[PDB]
Amino acid sequence: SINQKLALVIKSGKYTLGYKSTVKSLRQGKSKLIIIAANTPVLRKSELEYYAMLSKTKVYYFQGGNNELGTAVGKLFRVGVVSILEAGDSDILTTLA
Amino acid sequence: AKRTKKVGITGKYGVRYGSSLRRQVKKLEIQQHARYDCSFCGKKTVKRGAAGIWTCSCCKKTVAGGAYTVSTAAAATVRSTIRRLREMVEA
Amino acid sequence: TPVTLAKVIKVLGRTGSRGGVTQVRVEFLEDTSRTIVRNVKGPVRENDILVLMESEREARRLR
Amino acid sequence: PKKRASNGRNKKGRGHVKPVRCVNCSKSIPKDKAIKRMAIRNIVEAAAVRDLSEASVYPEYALPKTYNKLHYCVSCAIHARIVRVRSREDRKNRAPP
Amino acid sequence: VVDPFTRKEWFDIKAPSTFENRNVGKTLVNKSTGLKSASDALKGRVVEVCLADLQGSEDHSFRKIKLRVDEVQGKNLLTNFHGMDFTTDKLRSMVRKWQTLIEANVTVKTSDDYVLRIFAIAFTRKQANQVKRHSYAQSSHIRAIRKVISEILTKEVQGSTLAQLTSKLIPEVINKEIENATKDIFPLQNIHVRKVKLLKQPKFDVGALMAL
Amino acid sequence: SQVFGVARIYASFNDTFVHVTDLSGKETIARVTGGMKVKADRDESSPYAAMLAAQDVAAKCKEVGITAVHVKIRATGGTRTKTPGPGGQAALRALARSGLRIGRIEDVTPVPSDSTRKKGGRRGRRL
Amino acid sequence: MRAKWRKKRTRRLKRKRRKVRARSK
Amino acid sequence: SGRGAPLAKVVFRDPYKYRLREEIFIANEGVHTGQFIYAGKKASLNVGNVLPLGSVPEGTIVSNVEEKPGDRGALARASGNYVIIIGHNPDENKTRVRLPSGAKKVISSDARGVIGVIAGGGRVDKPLLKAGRAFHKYRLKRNSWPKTRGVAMNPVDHPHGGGNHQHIGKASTISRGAVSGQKAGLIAARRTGLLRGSQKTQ
RNA sequence: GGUGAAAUUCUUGGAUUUAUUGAAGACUAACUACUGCGAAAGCAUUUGCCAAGGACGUUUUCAUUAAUCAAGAACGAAAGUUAGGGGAUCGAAGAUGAUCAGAUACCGUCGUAGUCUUAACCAUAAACUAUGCCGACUAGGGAUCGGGUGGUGUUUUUUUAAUGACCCACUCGGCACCUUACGAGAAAUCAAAGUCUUUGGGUUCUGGGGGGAGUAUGGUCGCAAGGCUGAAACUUAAAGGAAUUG
RNA sequence: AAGAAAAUGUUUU
Ligand SMILES: [K+]
Ligand SMILES: [K+]
Ligand SMILES: [K+]
Ligand SMILES: [Mg+2]
Ligand SMILES: [Mg+2]
Ligand SMILES: [Mg+2]
Ligand SMILES: [Mg+2]
Ligand SMILES: [Mg+2]
Ligand SMILES: [Mg+2]
Ligand SMILES: [Mg+2]
Ligand SMILES: [Mg+2]
Ligand SMILES: [Mg+2]
Ligand SMILES: [Mg+2]
Ligand SMILES: [Mg+2]
Ligand SMILES: [Mg+2]
Ligand SMILES: [Mg+2]
Ligand SMILES: [Mg+2]
Ligand SMILES: [Mg+2]
Ligand SMILES: [Mg+2]
Ligand SMILES: [Mg+2]
Ligand SMILES: [Mg+2]
Ligand SMILES: [Mg+2]
Ligand SMILES: [Zn+2]
Ligand SMILES: [Zn+2]
């Protein structure tokens, strides 16, 4: 599932948590995938999709809200969007859709 | 310390109005004064205004709900019934 | 009232609470490839012609 | 004393078996304890299979059968002679006739 | 004192357009009058006819077909496919002890607009050399078999209209497809499509009904 | 070549119904019962009453224009009996014998995929 | 007496005793 | 004020003039601020949308239902109440519905209603617990509180007044044909006493 | 309609029956078994998610970490309690019909509470296998569920094979069962209720004639119903278990 | 297929 891939990404790869750093990565062109929490506001979701299509970046929609995304990424705070910068030894980039 | 054994919030009513009435009022007052998770921002910041109005201190969004709880059991079953009927209509 | 007769081809046994009735399989004289089971009150033996007011009622045992 | 070595039922390793209702009196009896008989009678015997065959519009109709599982309570089974009181040695014979 | 059968008139239920035989029978309905029309009294009637009578072959003695009067043309009631079911005798005959009964049901929309629920049934069976007397499945076989049957039914519809699915049910090609796809999972003697239920129909589209 | 109706023999205890309808079931022809054929308040379910009722149903059907009936036999069903009454066989035999043609007999007793609570209490009728 | 109804009668008697002692002081 | 249900202020665009029309709906529960409300025959079956009664499926739960098309809401307006659509008659286009009192009502299928239940439900489940709370409840509704008992008045003041003991003296069940000044007590009561039995008579 | 027979009851404002739709709530038939899982109470529609669990396999790891357990806890059918929701069915109370010598009992027609659920209580059942748990040993047998191993096996197509199902043999663990009892028992019976006067593997709980009595009293828990703990005075020669003949 | 009613019997030997 996505929880195992995300956990392996946290423990091995590179990631950034939060809207501002995610947009920074997208506009730097150095993000591989962005995972958006289900309860993210739709305007923010659409802007992230616009940034991702401009940077030719893949978007995955997490089934949980920000609380569930924070738990999945292994943090004790809510996470609205995750940007995978390096996948590490994880198949999250390729095992999509 | 624990200041009361069982009255809880209804310790403000003293010995008046009867134990059973104070018990009912305790349950509904705790229910109406609790903080609830916001379905939009994901924070436990939804508090009641007047009866039936539940506003999130964060993101300033307010939802119509039950008088003393954010969502009633009637609300859950009506939402489910409308979802079922809507899905049948659309497919 | 239609008049129909049959002939007893087998005597099945005594029935009724007091054993007064006799169970007989009877073959209809007309259209002889037809047998029905009937309840009879009097003493019955084989090759005896019974007269039937009604033709179609499979007689069940009298408990 | 204990009349039946296992019990008057068939339940070991369960604790609870959902009840069924007797077809004759509607008494609640555990399904494992209920006396179950299958009735597979032809839909029309009536000493009249030949009558239905002659009256039928189809050649070689192959008239159907009616299937019915009947559950009896102990009292109803004994009164209706579905099962009979047996000698002490005969009780231990589970083989059907 | 009234004898209402004098004011009834007979209509021919020209029920199918593709099954084998357009004639299923006749029905009666009260004569059209000033304030009550026979076409209104009809046009909702469901006639359920045996597929054996509708195909002329007795190997369809089960699988009754439901046919709804949809439009009236001059004493002829043109119907359309409304649903299909096994007979109780066949269902109870297939359901036996000392074997596992596997049931699958899907809700899928046909090619044009038709929404259907398909109920398929299967029964575990012993092998030819089997000595064990019950031949049950391990319920992971049941889950896999149900998954396969659901996928098969969902594929067979959505590539078929109501008419194509109706012409597909009669030769029972779905049953042999289930047998081919689950034979490597567990034996499954008695695979059948026991029921087709029509949940929602599109706009009445008399043009589409006029396939006869 | 034949004009077909539906027989709809509902054979409970305490009564039997012989209900010939059209192939659709909307239009009904000569629904008749053993309660209308006998007056004893106990014999309503008797096979003789069922036979007389079926004879009357077949007569009126042959007057209306029905020549054959597809037979649908049922018990009370639901939660109660599942066993067809004493009158169903008599009604079916009488319809067969009265000149009507017979077709496609089916047992359509309403059988729950599971039931509401059956009447009688958990101890049942105690007689 | 059936033991179930013996228990029920004892329970009724016990409640009656509590009521009588409670009326007393 | 004086209303248990919260109100929803919903802004629509004027279709014929360039301006906004603000409407005061009764807030259905689940409706939030910033939510889009869709009103019309082609509106979706989502909570808070306003649809004609004939345009919703069987068993739909609606609120603020019109008795006549265009009266802008008459039925199921108190908090927690709703109307169920129990059937349609497209010919002679009508809708059979279940009202909060349990009455069956036939309404023109073009009469509108809001999908969902009125917010603020469960309001009357809390004991008022205080004459002060009843005072404040009725201070914003009307001058109907507190209420003096008729048996506690004088014969001049009420039918029930007078007597050396407080008692009605005659039956308090009052005929439907009684006149103003006589209708004190139980008007045209089909029965009295503690309700033992089932309601919703066939 | 209902019944052994009836009657209450509904019915030409069309009952019962039919057909067509629709809704509500409950429930999960058949398959369903001397079959499975769980500590027990219990658990039976599909699918998804979430954690959990036994057995097996292991030339994996730690190394005595363990057994049973006052006090102390968690869970604990049904009924019942409090507040919502829901209230189709059945249905303590109640209303009635009938039977009767009486019959506000059985039987019939309704029907409140309840039945379902949510959030809290309650903590009891013939909560049973009336059989504590852990460990070792002591007959024979065939089935069956889960896992594993092997076969010149059969079948299934993929293309060689291989998984699947089945067959054979073994094995570990489980629900049980058949015979015989070396053995035990008062017997019924028991592979444990055996390895007990040839009495000792470890450990917890309970009983000491029948009533009075699970009563009184005190304490404690519960909103309550009640739960847990729990006597005595006095009374009594049997009460009781299993089996035998009538 | 099934079949309504049926209460009571002093003490000791
Ligand atoms: K007065
Ligand atoms: K109820
Ligand atoms: K003496
Ligand atoms: Mg005994
Ligand atoms: Mg138990
Ligand atoms: Mg009658
Ligand atoms: Mg008896
Ligand atoms: Mg007042
Ligand atoms: Mg006053
Ligand atoms: Mg005064
Ligand atoms: Mg007066
Ligand atoms: Mg006056
Ligand atoms: Mg005075
Ligand atoms: Mg009618
Ligand atoms: Mg099932
Ligand atoms: Mg199983
Ligand atoms: Mg303890
Ligand atoms: Mg309860
Ligand atoms: Mg106990
Ligand atoms: Mg003692
Ligand atoms: Mg004895
Ligand atoms: Mg004596
Ligand atoms: Zn918020
Ligand atoms: Zn019974």
UniProtKB/Swiss-Prot annotation, chain A:
GO cellular component: cytoplasm; cytosol; cytosolic large ribosomal subunit
Coiled-coil annotated spans: none
Cross-linked residues, Glycyl lysine isopeptide (Lys-Gly) (interchain with G-Cter in ubiquitin): 14, 45, 75
Keywords: Cytoplasm, Isopeptide bond, Ribonucleoprotein, Ribosomal protein, Ubl conjugation
InterPro entries associated with the record: Ribosomal_eL30-like, Ribosomal_eL30-like_sf, Ribosomal_eL30_CS, Ribosomal_eL8/eL30/eS12/Gad45
GO biological process assignments: cytoplasmic translation; negative regulation of mRNA splicing, via spliceosome; rRNA processing
Keyword Ribonucleoprotein: yes
Gene Ontology terms, MF aspect: pre-mRNA 5'-splice site binding; RNA binding; structural constituent of ribosome
Gene3D superfamilies registered for this protein in UniProt: 3.30.1330.30
Compartments reported by the entry: Cytoplasm
Record's subunit section: Component of the large ribosomal subunit (LSU). Mature yeast ribosomes consist of a small (40S) and a large (60S) subunit. The 40S small subunit contains 1 molecule of ribosomal RNA (18S rRNA) and 33 different proteins (encoded by 57 genes). The large 60S subunit contains 3 rRNA molecules (25S, 5.8S and 5S rRNA) and 46 different proteins (encoded by 81 genes).
PANTHER family with a match to the protein in the record: RIBOSOMAL PROTEIN L30
Similarity annotation: Belongs to the eukaryotic ribosomal protein eL30 family.
Misc. remarks from the entry: Present with 59300 molecules/cell in log phase SD medium.
Name of this protein: Large ribosomal subunit protein eL30
Native organism: Saccharomyces cerevisiae (strain ATCC 204508 / S288c)
Taxonomic lineage of the native organism: Eukaryota, Fungi, Dikarya, Ascomycota, Saccharomycotina
Gene expressing this chain: RPL30
Curated annotation (Swiss-Prot), chain B:
Cellular component, GO, one term: cytosolic large ribosomal subunit
A molecular function GO annotation: zinc ion binding
Assigned keywords, A-Z: Cytoplasm, Metal-binding, Phosphoprotein, Ribonucleoprotein, Ribosomal protein, Zinc, Zinc-finger
Transit peptide recorded as keyword: no
Pfam assignment, any one: Ribosomal_L37ae
Gene Ontology BP annotations: cytoplasmic translation
Ribonucleoprotein among keywords: yes
General function of this protein: Component of the ribosome, a large ribonucleoprotein complex responsible for the synthesis of proteins in the cell. The small ribosomal subunit (SSU) binds messenger RNAs (mRNAs) and translates the encoded message by selecting cognate aminoacyl-transfer RNA (tRNA) molecules. The large subunit (LSU) contains the ribosomal catalytic site termed the peptidyl transferase center (PTC), which catalyzes the formation of peptide bonds, thereby polymerizing the amino acids delivered by tRNAs into a polypeptide chain.
Description of how the protein assembles with itself and partners: Component of the large ribosomal subunit (LSU). Mature yeast ribosomes consist of a small (40S) and a large (60S) subunit. The 40S small subunit contains 1 molecule of ribosomal RNA (18S rRNA) and 33 different proteins (encoded by 57 genes). The large 60S subunit contains 3 rRNA molecules (25S, 5.8S and 5S rRNA) and 46 different proteins (encoded by 81 genes).
Family to which the UniProt record says this protein belongs: Belongs to the eukaryotic ribosomal protein eL43 family.
Name used for this protein in its record: Large ribosomal subunit protein eL43A
Organism encoding this protein: Saccharomyces cerevisiae (strain ATCC 204508 / S288c) (Baker's yeast)
Curated annotation (Swiss-Prot), chain C:
GO terms for MF: structural constituent of ribosome
Name of the protein this chain belongs to: Small ribosomal subunit protein eS28A
UniProt KW Signal keyword: no
Role of this protein: Component of the ribosome, a large ribonucleoprotein complex responsible for the synthesis of proteins in the cell. The small ribosomal subunit (SSU) binds messenger RNAs (mRNAs) and translates the encoded message by selecting cognate aminoacyl-transfer RNA (tRNA) molecules. The large subunit (LSU) contains the ribosomal catalytic site termed the peptidyl transferase center (PTC), which catalyzes the formation of peptide bonds, thereby polymerizing the amino acids delivered by tRNAs into a polypeptide chain.
InterPro entries: NA-bd_OB-fold, Ribosomal_eS28, Ribosomal_eS28_CS
Annotated localization: Cytoplasm
CDD domains in the cross-refs: S1_S28E
Keywords from the named record: Acetylation, Cytoplasm, Ribonucleoprotein, Ribosomal protein
GO process terms (BP): maturation of SSU-rRNA; positive regulation of nuclear-transcribed mRNA catabolic process, deadenylation-dependent decay; ribosomal small subunit assembly; ribosomal subunit export from nucleus; translation
Additional record remark: Present with 94500 molecules/cell in log phase SD medium.
A GO cellular-component term linked to this record: cytosol
Cited Pfam families: Ribosomal_S28e (PF01200)
Recorded family membership: Belongs to the eukaryotic ribosomal protein eS28 family.
PANTHER family: 40S RIBOSOMAL PROTEIN S28, SMALL RIBOSOMAL SUBUNIT PROTEIN ES28
Native source organism of the sequence: Saccharomyces cerevisiae (strain ATCC 204508 / S288c)
Listed Gene3D superfamilies: Nucleic acid-binding proteins
Main location per the UniProt record: cytoplasm
Ribonucleoprotein found in the keyword field: yes
From Swiss-Prot, chain E:
Single biological process term from Gene Ontology: cytoplasmic translation
Key word Acetylation present: yes
Lineage: superkingdom: Eukaryota
Keyword field: Acetylation, Cytoplasm, Isopeptide bond, Phosphoprotein, Ribonucleoprotein, Ribosomal protein, Ubl conjugation
A GO molecular-function annotation: structural constituent of ribosome
GO CC terms of this entry: 90S preribosome; cytosol; cytosolic small ribosomal subunit
Cellular compartment(s): Cytoplasm
Keyword Iron-sulfur applies: no
Record PTM text: N-terminally acetylated by acetyltransferase NatA.
Family named by the database record: Belongs to the eukaryotic ribosomal protein eS1 family.
Oligomeric and partner information: Component of the small ribosomal subunit (SSU). Mature yeast ribosomes consist of a small (40S) and a large (60S) subunit. The 40S small subunit contains 1 molecule of ribosomal RNA (18S rRNA) and 33 different proteins (encoded by 57 genes). The large 60S subunit contains 3 rRNA molecules (25S, 5.8S and 5S rRNA) and 46 different proteins (encoded by 81 genes). eS1 interacts directly with uS11 and eS26, which form part of the mRNA exit tunnel.
Miscellaneous remark of the record: Present with 92400 molecules/cell in log phase SD medium.
Descriptive protein name: Small ribosomal subunit protein eS1A
Organism: Saccharomyces cerevisiae (strain ATCC 204508 / S288c)
